Enzyme design. Sequence first.
Site, short mmCIF file in Angstrom:
data_model
loop_
_atom_site.label_atom_id
_atom_site.label_comp_id
_atom_site.label_asym_id
_atom_site.label_seq_id
_atom_site.Cartn_x
_atom_site.Cartn_y
_atom_site.Cartn_z
N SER A 143 0.88 -1.15 0.00
CA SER A 143 0.00 0.00 0.00
C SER A 143 0.93 1.21 0.00
O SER A 143 0.35 2.35 -0.54
CB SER A 143 -0.65 0.06 1.34
OG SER A 143 -1.01 1.41 1.62
N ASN A 196 -8.35 -1.12 -1.48
CA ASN A 196 -7.67 -1.27 -2.74
C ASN A 196 -8.61 -1.07 -3.91
O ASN A 196 -8.17 -0.54 -4.93
CB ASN A 196 -7.04 -2.68 -2.88
CG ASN A 196 -5.91 -2.91 -1.90
OD1 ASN A 196 -5.06 -2.06 -1.71
ND2 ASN A 196 -5.90 -4.08 -1.28
N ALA A 246 2.07 -3.27 3.10
CA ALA A 246 2.32 -4.67 3.34
C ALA A 246 1.91 -5.50 2.14
O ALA A 246 0.94 -5.18 1.43
CB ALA A 246 1.58 -5.14 4.59
N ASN A 278 6.22 -9.01 6.81
CA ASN A 278 5.09 -8.17 7.20
C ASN A 278 4.90 -8.21 8.72
O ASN A 278 4.22 -9.08 9.27
CB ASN A 278 3.81 -8.62 6.47
CG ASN A 278 2.58 -7.82 6.90
OD1 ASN A 278 2.70 -6.77 7.54
ND2 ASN A 278 1.38 -8.33 6.56
N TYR A 305 -10.59 2.24 4.21
CA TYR A 305 -9.39 1.90 3.43
C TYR A 305 -9.65 0.73 2.46
O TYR A 305 -10.21 -0.31 2.84
CB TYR A 305 -8.22 1.61 4.39
CG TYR A 305 -7.01 1.20 3.66
CD1 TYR A 305 -6.69 -0.15 3.59
CD2 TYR A 305 -6.20 2.14 2.98
CE1 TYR A 305 -5.60 -0.59 2.89
CE2 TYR A 305 -5.05 1.69 2.28
CZ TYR A 305 -4.79 0.32 2.25
OH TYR A 305 -3.75 -0.26 1.56
N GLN A 307 -10.56 -5.49 -0.72
CA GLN A 307 -9.94 -6.28 -1.78
C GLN A 307 -10.88 -6.46 -2.96
O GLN A 307 -12.11 -6.61 -2.78
CB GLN A 307 -9.60 -7.69 -1.24
CG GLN A 307 -8.61 -7.70 -0.06
CD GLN A 307 -9.10 -8.52 1.17
OE1 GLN A 307 -8.30 -9.21 1.82
NE2 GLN A 307 -10.39 -8.43 1.48
#
Length: 355
Positions: A61, A149, A312, A337, A147, A117
């Site tokens: 990210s 993606n 990560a 991670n 948050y 996701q």
Amino acid sequence: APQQINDIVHRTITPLIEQQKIPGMAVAVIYQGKPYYFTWGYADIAKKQPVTQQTLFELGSVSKTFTGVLGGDAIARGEIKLSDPTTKYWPELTAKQWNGITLLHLATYTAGGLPLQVPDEVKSSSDLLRFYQNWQPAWAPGTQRLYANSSIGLFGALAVKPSGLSFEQAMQTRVFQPLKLNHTWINVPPAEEKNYAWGYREGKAVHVSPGALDAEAYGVKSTIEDMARWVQSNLKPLDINEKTLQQGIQLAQSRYWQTGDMYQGLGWEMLDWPVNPDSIINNKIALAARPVKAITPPTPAVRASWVHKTGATGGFGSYVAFIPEKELGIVMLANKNYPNPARVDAAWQILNALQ
């Protein structure tokens, strides 16, 4: 390095590596506009390859900071506007939930609960259309931050549409090349594989898997040297000769939304400096939904900020933070991670000491 920098970095990072069992790590400190590099341990445990200043790490990210700046550059070019409806750049997105969702909402995770996701099953452009068409928001646009993606990833893909370039070509031509980031990649070339660290998850060597919108959301791999250069470019955008890139960097550090002590930029997140780590801290939470207040209009980049972004992948943990008003920054790249709070603690310990 000046001994002060040597000492704070080594005394902070060595214990971190020991406690988190990190196989390999690289750190850059940017101090009064000069980089200092540090490396430890292994890029590839089995082949006994050390971490060097040339080792590539997956940014995860932190890639979103590149997407945000590329988006800013497209705005500066007059190719897109953040106030534009999503449907302006994707007219096939006809489902009525998209009415009122702008490029700003996508870029800042405020579209109304786009998922973290993009599902694995989504591959093709058809699959992606179907996914976004079928998605049902929990919330009205511009009311809560989640948050995602799928949110900034879509922003990235749409932002480059007017240019006619693929996302990767746009990023290369408009961001990497002008900034001389010559060892930063969305796809790692075969020539560079010698330098590509393995990530480690539960002791197993792993690299990030392909996925829809991966380039846009989490697709960048880079060296500690290039990432130091990225931090310099974001500390001092007026030194950048390319006019739209200079403006784009500025736009990505504008403050669009506030939640608690944090402000959302494009990719970058910001708090007022000075700040303590517990407030910075405030991925152990799989989903945190937070109400946001619009900053109307957005505050231009504040020099007295802690500007940062955690990253990560399955096998890697990255962190970048800088303070423009102190010409100070840090990049920490690791091939495990490990917990986010430990990253912020270490970064703050180092930066506070040099500040």
